[PDB]
Nucleic acid binder design. Structure first.
Lengths: 85, 101, 264, 64, 95
RNA sequence: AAAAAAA
RNA sequence: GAACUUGAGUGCAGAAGAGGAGAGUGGAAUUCCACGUGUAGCGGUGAAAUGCGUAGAGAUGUGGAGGAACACCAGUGGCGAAGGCGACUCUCUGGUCUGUAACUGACGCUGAGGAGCGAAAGCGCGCCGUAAACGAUGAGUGCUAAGUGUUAGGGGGUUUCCGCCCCUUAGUGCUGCAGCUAACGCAUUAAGCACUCCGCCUGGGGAGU
């Protein structure tokens, strides 16, 4: 939902106008992933959906890794805040 | 004594059968091209279908029909002529319905 | 508007003289040919149009309902046309046998005596019976003798006129199309035959597509549906399909226009 | 040769508006083709759906 | 919650006491499950285009709502069970 | 091809 | 190290989908069997058998086989990575396109192996998984005449709007320069001109042994 997404944005955003930061995006994806994963627990056979997941998951990974190389600090913070291992 | 009915027209390439029923599909009357002693090609022809419709219809009028629904089955040439023969026998056609499987 | 004003007058005059019960000339239109109308009723059931009635006892309204249904359809022009080809022609008669087309019991022509002789007679009978008051037996017997010959003759001369009129139109349409050889037109299939199919253009110019020019397949005519069917391709040209044609040949003397199929 | 729904500016076809849909079925009840009606593509879709809903709800027939 | 449009047909062989009871029942179902009835037409007894459960007519009810699935879903469940409602559809109101 | 009607 | 926004993405606004997975539900026909009608057919086909039956059947309903599919719409339309996906509604969910340019600031590309999806069959629903699973044509990006159609958008012009007109974006078509090509052909949907990375080939047969 868009209210949920606005929460997320407000929670992670690096400044007032920020929605483009890894932080933000990782936040969002993360939720999506989460929500989607749950979808696939029930809908195991929905392959197609499964595909988008992977692409999501991947996006994340790139963003994390982007971050982890930009500024480890921010990356540490983030992965703690989202709970990402 | 029933007034409304269905006229089931099975027009095949070989034959035309014409059954007339009440609304619940109970059989009032019937005729067919081969019941009127047409044989071979003649059973196929629309003239035999026409005559088959009349004979089925005239049997129904004794049982006191007035209005018909019509159903058509099969590819045969009889449906057009047969239908007109139900109108021409007297019985008004409400609606014709192609129910080919 | 004028039409309507000429019709009601014509209907008014005819009714007056019917009730006067004097020898008079009417403009009748008899009931259509039952065999021709039966075939028409078959033809329209192919397009989905179902008619209430039998061919022997059809009321004009039932025909009107069809012409309302097909209005603003591609199949309009032809069903219309085939309906027409089921009607009888209207003729003059001493008896009041009604006018099918107008759905009226009384009709004459009163309103154009300059150009029609039956209208000029109606006027003379009006003058005779109404104005002069000459409703004597001898006056009636005179007119009762002569009207049948008049009615038959004038009816012949009308048909003659129409045939010639049309024959000059077809000639001048053919003359118009001489310079259009090679040009493509959009048109509609007006009629299908065993030898080919007729296509009417937007300006009501009609030309033939000969089966020879249908080089893509062997086309078999279906008479019941009104359609040429390709054996191999399974292309179906039916009455009332719009197609794009090209002008191949025009013979002015013969009044022929020949078309080839560019596309459907 | 114009679209009803693009002419008259009708963004939303409704399944309930039986009269409107009835224009666009054949007498037998079959959906009329785009080429016949002149409908826009977009709407041909919308229209089809509505008729399909309609027919489900017995507003329209499948086979008149 | 999101806008739906329910329509349904009530069997033609009932008096207006029974009919009202239906409507109130099924209006009660929706609002009971967190729905809010924004509109409620009654199209009255129409001829059906074909013969549903041996009836050639029926009374149409068109409920607009706003609700969760659950509401609509409960409705649909019960609508199916019920013999009074012969047919129905729920539909989302396309944005 | 082919109807009224008008002209 | 520092800076930037053109690539990449997130916002925000908008668009169209037979994209996928569940759950119903609408009609169809089907023939599984019984029964109520039914009253002598019916049945091939040059026309006769071939057969078919009054033991009431062809035929017509009613209980149903209870299993498969969803005509018209339907389009070299659309959607999908491929295989593929067409009744309707709801439930959950994937992606794509347009427009804005608010944000991030190269975060990108390809990708052996690996993992997953993925016909007949093979068959034992599961493994199998091989597929003209070959539009005979990896992916990405940029550049390089035109003409015409369609799908979903964007803007301006008139135009009230509808309608037309023009420009732009993305996709799908036909036609055709430059170039390329053994020729055939391809030709901004390249098989043209380039750069990156991957797959693959190096006579036929033997032998996919």
């Amino acid at each position: 939902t868009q209210e949920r997404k606005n929460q997320l944005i407000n929670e992670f955003k690096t400044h007032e106008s920020d929605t483009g930061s890894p932080e933000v995006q990782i936040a969002i994806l993360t939720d999506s992933i989460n929500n989607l994963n749950e979808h696939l627990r029930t809908h195991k056979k929905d392959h197609h959906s499964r595909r988008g997941l992977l692409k999501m998951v991947g996006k994340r990974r790139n963003l994390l890794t982007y971050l982890r190389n930009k500024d480890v600090t921010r990356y540490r913070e983030l992965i703690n805040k989202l709970g990402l291992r | 004594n029933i007034e409304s009915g269905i006229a089931h027209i099975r027009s095949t390439f070989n034959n035309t059968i014409v059954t007339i029923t009440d609304t619940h599909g109970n059989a009032i009357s019937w005729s067919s091209a081969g019941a009127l002693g047409f044989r071979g090609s003649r059973k196929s022809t629309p003239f035999a279908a026409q005559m088959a419709a009349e004979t089925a219809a005239k049997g129904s009028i004794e049982h006191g029909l007035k209005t018909l629904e019509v159903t058509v089955k099969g590819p045969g040439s009889g449906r057009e002529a047969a239908i007109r023969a139900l109108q021409a026998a007297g019985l008004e056609v409400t609606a014709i319905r192609d129910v080919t499987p | 508007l004028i039409e309507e004003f000429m019709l009601v007058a014509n209907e008014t005059v005819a009714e007056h003289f019917h009730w006067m019960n004097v020898p008079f000339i009417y403009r009748i239109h008899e009931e259509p040919n039952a065999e021709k109308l039966q075939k028409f009723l078959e033809f329209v059931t192919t397009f989905g149009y179902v008619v209430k009635g039998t061919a022997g006892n059809i009321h004009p309204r039932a025909l009107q309902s069809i012409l309302d249904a097909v209005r603003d359809r591609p199949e309009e022009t032809v069903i219309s046309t085939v309906m027409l080809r089921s009607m009888k022609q209207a003729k003059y008669d001493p008896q009041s046998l009604g006018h099918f087309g107008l759905s009226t019991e009384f009709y004459t022509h009163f309103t154009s005596p300059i150009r029609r002789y039956p209208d000029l007679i109606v006027h003379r009978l009006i003058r005779t019976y109404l104005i002069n008051g000459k409703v004597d037996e001898a006056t009636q017997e005179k007119w009762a003798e002569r009207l049948p010959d008049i009615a038959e003759h004038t009816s012949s001369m009308e048909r003659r006129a129409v045939d010639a009129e049309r024959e000059t139109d077809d000639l001048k349409k053919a003359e118009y199309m001489l310079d259009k050889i090679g040009e493509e037109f959009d048109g509609m299939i007006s009629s299908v035959t065993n030898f080919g199919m007729f296509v009417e253009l937007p300006n009501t110019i009609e030309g033939l597509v000969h089966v020879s020019f249908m080089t893509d397949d062997y086309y078999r005519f279906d008479e019941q549906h009104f359609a040429m069917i390709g054996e191999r391709t399974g292309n179906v040209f039916r009455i009332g399909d719009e197609i794009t044609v090209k002008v191949v040949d025009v013979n002015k003397d013969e009044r022929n226009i020949d078309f080839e199929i560019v596309g459907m | 040769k114009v679209c009803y729904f693009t002419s008259n500016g009708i963004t939303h076809i409704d399944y309930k508006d039986v009269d409107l849909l009835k224009k666009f079925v054949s007498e037998r009840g079959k959906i009329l083709p785009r080429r016949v009606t002149g409908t826009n593509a977009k709407y041909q879709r919308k229209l089809t759906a509505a008729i399909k809903r309609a027919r489900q709800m017995a507003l329209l027939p499948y086979v008149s | 919650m999101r806008k739906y449009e329910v329509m349904y047909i009530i069997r033609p062989n009932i008096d207006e006491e029974s009919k009202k009871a239906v409507i109130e029942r099924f209006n009660n179902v929706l609002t009971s499950n967190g729905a809010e009835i924004t509109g409620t037409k009654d199209w009255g007894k129409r001829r059906l285009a074909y013969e549903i459960n041996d009836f050639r007519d029926g009374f149409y009810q068109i409920v607009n709502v706003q609700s969760d699935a659950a509401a609509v879903q409960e409705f649909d469940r019960l609508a199916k069970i019920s013999d009074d409602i012969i047919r129905h559809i729920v539909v989302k109101e396309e944005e």
